[PDB]
Amino acid sequence: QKDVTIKSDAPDTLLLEKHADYIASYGSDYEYCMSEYLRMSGVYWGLTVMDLMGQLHRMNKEEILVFIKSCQHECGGVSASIGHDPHLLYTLSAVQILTLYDSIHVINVDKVVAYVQSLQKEDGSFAGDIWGEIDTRFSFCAVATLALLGKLDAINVEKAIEFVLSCMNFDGGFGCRPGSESHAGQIYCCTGFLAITSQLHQVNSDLLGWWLCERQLPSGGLNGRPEKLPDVCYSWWVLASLKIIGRLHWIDREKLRSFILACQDEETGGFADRPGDMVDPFHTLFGIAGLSLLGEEQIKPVSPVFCMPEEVLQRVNVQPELVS
Amino acid sequence: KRLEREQKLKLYQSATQAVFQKRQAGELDESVLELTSQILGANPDFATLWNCRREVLQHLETEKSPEESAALVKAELGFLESCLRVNPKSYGTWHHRCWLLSRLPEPNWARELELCARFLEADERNFHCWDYRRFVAAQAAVAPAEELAFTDSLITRNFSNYSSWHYRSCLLPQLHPQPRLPENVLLKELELVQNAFFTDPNDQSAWFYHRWLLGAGSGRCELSVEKSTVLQSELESCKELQELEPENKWCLLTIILLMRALDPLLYEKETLQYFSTLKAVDPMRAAYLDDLRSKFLLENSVLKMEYA
Numbered sequence: 001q002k003d004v005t006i007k008s009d010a011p012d013t014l015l016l017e018k019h020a021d022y023i024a025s026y027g028s029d030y031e032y033c034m035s036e037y038l039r040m041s042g043v044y045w046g047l048t049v050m051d052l053m054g055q056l057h058r059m060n061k062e063e064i065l066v067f068i069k070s071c072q073h074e075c076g077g078v079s080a081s082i083g084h085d086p087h088l089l090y091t092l093s094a095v096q097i098l099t100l101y102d103s104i105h106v107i108n109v110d111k112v113v114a115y116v117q118s119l120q121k122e123d124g125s126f127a128g129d130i131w132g133e134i135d136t137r138f139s140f141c142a143v144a145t146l147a148l149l150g151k152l153d154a155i156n157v158e159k160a161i162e163f164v165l166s167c168m169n170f171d172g173g174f175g176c177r178p179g180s181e182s183h184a185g186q187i188y189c190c191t192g193f194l195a196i197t198s199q200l201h202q203v204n205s206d207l208l209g210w211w212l213c214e215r216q217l218p219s220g221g222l223n224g225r226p227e228k229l230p231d232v233c234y235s236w237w238v239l240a241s242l243k244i245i246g247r248l249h250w251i252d253r254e255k256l257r258s259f260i261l262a263c264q265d266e267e268t269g270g271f272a273d274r275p276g277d278m279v280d281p282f283h284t285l286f287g288i289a290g291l292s293l294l295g296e297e298q299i300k301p302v303s304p305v306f307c308m309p310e311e312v313l314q315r316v317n318v319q320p321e322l323v324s
Numbered sequence: 325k326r327l328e329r330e331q332k333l334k335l336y337q338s339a340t341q342a343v344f345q346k347r348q349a350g351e352l353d354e355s356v357l358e359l360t361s362q363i364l365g366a367n368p369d370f371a372t373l374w375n376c377r378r379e380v381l382q383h384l385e386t387e388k389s390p391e392e393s394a395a396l397v398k399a400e401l402g403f404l405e406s407c408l409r410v411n412p413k414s415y416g417t418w419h420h421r422c423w424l425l426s427r428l429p430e431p432n433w434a435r436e437l438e439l440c441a442r443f444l445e446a447d448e449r450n451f452h453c454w455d456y457r458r459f460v461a462a463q464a465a466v467a468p469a470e471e472l473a474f475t476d477s478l479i480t481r482n483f484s485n486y487s488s489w490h491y492r493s494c495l496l497p498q499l500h501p502q503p504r505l506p507e508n509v510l511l512k513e514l515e516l517v518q519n520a521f522f523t524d525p526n527d528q529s530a531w532f533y534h535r536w537l538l539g540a541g542s543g544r545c546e547l548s549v550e551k552s553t554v555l556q557s558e559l560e561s562c563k564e565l566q567e568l569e570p571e572n573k574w575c576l577l578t579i580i581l582l583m584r585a586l587d588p589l590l591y592e593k594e595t596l597q598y599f600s601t602l603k604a605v606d607p608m609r610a611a612y613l614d615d616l617r618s619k620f621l622l623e624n625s626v627l628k629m630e631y632a
């Protein structure tokens with residue numbers, strides 16, 4: 001029942017030029033400084049959305065490459081920013097960036113592999129860093145990083161699979177750890193994981209597919225679990241998961257497209273989490289990526305698994321088979 | 325308001341700068357705990373600073389007395405609780421509490437379970453807190469039966485029940501652990517959930533859980549007299565609700581699923597009729613419903629072809 005009501009003067013056209021301008025000018029501010037702890041991911045969101053729009057050249061490649069090198073630590077892991085601590089989240093983001101730029105050997109790939117390998121636990125799970133937080137988010141970060149480097153064989157894959165499957169729930173979904181409640185974010189991480197490791201036959205696609213399509217509210221937007229407000233990014237996790245399991249047609253594509261377009265800021269460019277709210281690069285990427293999965297002509301095809309242009313993944317020959 | 329943001333920034337930035345400088349210097353001391361407390365209060369997702377607190381507490385543990393270290397730990401628990409009250413959905417804060425409790429000589433787990441209960445009173449859907457409660461339950465060896473009673477009180481006292489029904493789905497198998505619930509348990513659960521959705525027909529969580537219970541059986545040709553009678557009773561009760569709430573899609577779907585559970589071929593006519601009504605009522609799901617109907621029509625052909 002909880003939903004937004006889209007006012008009738010909400011944007012109903014795609015404003016690609018404004019979005020490119022918004023991202024091109026981002027970080028030229030209070031919010032920028034307070035999100036330094038996730039800077040590497042911020043850079044990934046910006047570059048990926050620009051590349052999906054055909055505008056990657058407007059970003060500063062050489063500056064970003066030097067920044068990434070300076071964020072790899074002696075253990076091989078990559079931090080969010082210079083001086084911060086290494087983590088799987090920012091290691092993935094860094095590898096995705098270097099893959100976009102065909103510059104993987106800017107960092108020490110052997111040490112990245114060793115870092116990822118070192119974070120796997122006896123039950124097959126992965127910690128995010130040396131402090132031991134366990135979450136299926138990190139199982140996905142681990143295999144997505146290794147897949148992009150061609151080094152999936154470096155971890156214990158069967159045990160990693162066993163752990164992820166132990167996180168599958170009564171409703172067909174997945175949570176962060178065994179016993180955790182289903183959540184769209186975690187479902188994206190786990191279905192992406194199972195795509196990468198060739199285990200999608202173990203998902204109950206009809207059951208999970210149903211739970212996912214029930215995320216769509218009368219406004220057209222998707223929420224991330226029952227009784228929550230829709231958000232343009234939960235919209236993305238849900239759509240990518242549905243695509244991975246071959247069930248994207250189970251949501252009303254036109255109603256969702258209209259909800260995503262209504263989240264644009266016509267004055268500044270960018271997308272917000274919901275109509276009328278303040279935009280940010282995170283929601284700009286996931287709004288544009290959502291539109292691409294729904295088949296928007298002006299945007300490059302996007303990988304539902306890696307949230308990167310398909311043409312990039314074709315180049316490195318890392319293209320997981322989906323359900324359909 | 326605007327000028328004060330520049331006031332906060334510079335204090336945030338200078339404190340941040342000061343912490344990093346101290347860290348390279350190897351000054352693992354209380355000044356760092358002071359600086360990080362300022363920053364982590366406003367910004368608990370700054371993970372590197374939680375790492376810094378742990379490095380300082382680890383270092384101070386070595387060069388302080390048991391009583392001084394006990395004091396530091398109690399101060400840490402208070403700091404964590406104050407951070408949680410401000411932002412109860414931060415991964416970093418909940419993880420630091422787990423890290424802290426896991427290394428204590430004599431942790432008070434009962435106090436932690438009470439913290440969870442209080443946070444679940446404020447937001448019954450906070451998955452960070454449910455996850456923490458499972459951690460505490462495991463560490464304290466709390467039995468599935470006790471946690472089952474907790475979920476019951478939570479389900480009847482108010483709504484927002486998806487998280488509580490989920491916890492039940494994980495606890496029930498543990499009370500009856502197999503290498504697919506026993507029928508006596510299933511029948512009690514069906515009764516509990518049926519009450520739930522006739523109390524609030526708009527509560528989607530009871531309907532999702534009920535669909536799982538309808539699958540957790542032993543087959544339609546293995547239907548006992550009691551289970552057959554219970555499912556037929558649910559069927560008529562759903563039809564009752566359907567007259568009261570003609571736009572309620574959950575009841576229509578559940579009618580279809582019940583007829584499937586009872587006798588696919590005998591109810592084929594009615595099943596198809598209900599798909600037409602449901603698609604009219606829930607048009608966004610029409611594609612899903614067509615694929616489900618196609619799957620059921622395919623199962624029916626296989627059942628008809630099994631005829632001797």
Ligand SMILES: CN(C(=O)[C@H](Cc1cnc[nH]1)NC(=O)OCc1ccccc1)[C@@H](Cc1ccccc1)C(=O)N[C@@H](Cc1ccc(O)cc1)C(=O)NO
Pocket residue numbers: 038041044089093136137138140141184185186188189231233273282
């Ligand atoms: C850490 N994080 C979040 O907690 C966001 C917060 C939010 C989103 N919309 C409104 N607020 N939540 C979030 O990303 O939920 C996604 C998710 C949860 C669990 C598993 C996977 C994804 C966001 C950043 C953010 C902070 C504050 C406000 C908005 C965005 C974030 O970094 N998300 C990660 C999610 C992720 C992480 C790991 C993976 O393996 C896959 C995905 C991301 O997209 N990385 O590239």
Ligand SMILES: [Ca+2]
Pocket residue numbers: 056057058059060061
């Ligand atoms: Ca450039």
Ligand SMILES: [Zn+2]
Pocket residue numbers: 231232233234273283
């Ligand atoms: Zn969001």
